Design a protein around this ligand. Structure first.
Ligand SMILES: Nc1ncnc2c1ncn2[C@@H]1O[C@H](COP(=O)(O)OP(=O)(O)OP(=O)(O)O)[C@@H](O)[C@H]1O
Length: 337
């Protein structure tokens, strides 16, 4: 709403409106519609074909204000647009189209050709957000109208399966509205209005949006199975690849604290290729999905070793010991976060 329209867009948006309307009825001509006083599309007749003046004026202002809304959305999404040259407005180049195949209205639709114009990948990402916003507008309007999502379409109960997020929308509708708004942007460029799409802004939510404040769950064996001497081994399998830590913990490990933050646990974070005990040090490489991590402790000479898919992991130096020396204490139990 707060978007203000620059004077040249104010000059140009009306002719964009009726030019894309003539285009738009050319699309329904491709679909096979013909002009008729009746509204029913099933009998192939629809009065949207004729020019804007003889169009139902409520459909006319609907099309006009949706054109303005689309260009204001272009403005609001941070995509600046300039004027290429006065030649783009001076020229009125036209494709020849047979009158019988064209509409009844005298004003002949076809704009400057699509082949001459080129659409950049940034420009296509732009019309992606345009289709997103158009779908949101349609959904919000029907929601104030009272319509509600339903798997089976029901006009009587105002239930429509198309009231879904655009990422979840059906590919047919996505491609249809994508191409319509794409061709609208194509005409915008054809009138010599080069819109400079801003570069994609790198924003990562980092998966942190977990349900409730629970950030990680720690799984450990019972404190009674603590080992105080000998050689021990167990395997940890990574179904996914992500923020996990595996290793050995003392009976006093706190469930709320992360493994390796304090002295109670000795862990290996392969997601960052990071070893953890009272801090983080670089050790080993990163795992992928399906990798099996072998955790070995020798509690006679107080060493710990890790293997990823069989090969022994190494720290920055050539040493194979994740933790070279540590006290016996109360023992160690397998643990994973
Ligand atoms: N004649 C038209 N006038 C205005 N918008 C139209 C017209 N035809 C299609 N649209 C737009 O394309 C969408 C496709 O609608 P659909 O294929 O169900 O046919 P429609 O009966 O013309 O639609 P609607 O009554 O919702 O405008 C519509 O929701 C609307 O946004």
């Amino acid at each position: 709403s707060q978007i203000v329209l620059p004077p040249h867009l104010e000059r140009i948006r009306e002719k964009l409106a009726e030019n894309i309307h003539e285009l738009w009825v050319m699309n329904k001509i491709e679909l096979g519609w013909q002009y008729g006083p009746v509204r029913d599309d099933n009998k192939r007749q629809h009065p949207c074909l004729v020019e804007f003046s003889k169009l139902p004026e409520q459909e006319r202002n609907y099309n006009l204000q949706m054109s303005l809304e689309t260009l204001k959305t272009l403005l609001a999404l941070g995509c600046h647009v300039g004027i290429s040259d006065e030649h783009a407005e001076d020229k009125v180049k036209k494709m020849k189209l047979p009158k019988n195949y064209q509409l009844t209205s005298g004003y002949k639709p076809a704009p400057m050709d699509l082949s001459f114009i080129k659409l950049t990948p940034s420009q296509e990402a732009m019309v992606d957000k345009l289709a997103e916003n158009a779908h949101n507008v349609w959904a919000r309007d029907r929601i104030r109208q009272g319509w509600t999502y339903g798997i089976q379409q029901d006009v009587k109960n105002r239930r429509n399966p198309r009231l879904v997020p655009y990422t979840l929308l059906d590919d047919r509708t996505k491609k249809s509205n994508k191409d319509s708004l794409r061709e609208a942007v194509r005409t915008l460029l054809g009138y010599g209005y080069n819109l400079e799409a801003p570069d994609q802004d790198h924003a990562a939510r980092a998966e942190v949006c977990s349900g409730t404040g629970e950030r990680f769950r720690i799984f450990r064996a019972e404190k009674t199975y603590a080992v105080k001497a000998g050689r021990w081994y167990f395997e940890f399998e990574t179904v996914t690849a992500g923020d996990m830590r595996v290793g050995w913990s003392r009976p006093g490990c706190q469930p709320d604290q992360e493994l390796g933050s304090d002295e109670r646990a000795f862990a290996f974070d392969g997601f960052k290729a990071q070893r953890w005990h009272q801090g983080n040090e670089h050790y080993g490489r990163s795992w992928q999905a399906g990798d099996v991590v072998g955790c070995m402790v020798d509690m006679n000479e107080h060493t710990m070793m890790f293997t990823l898919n069989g090969e022994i992991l190494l720290d920055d130096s050539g040493s194979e010991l994740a933790f070279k020396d540590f006290d016996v204490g109360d023992g160690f139990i397998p643990v994973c976060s």
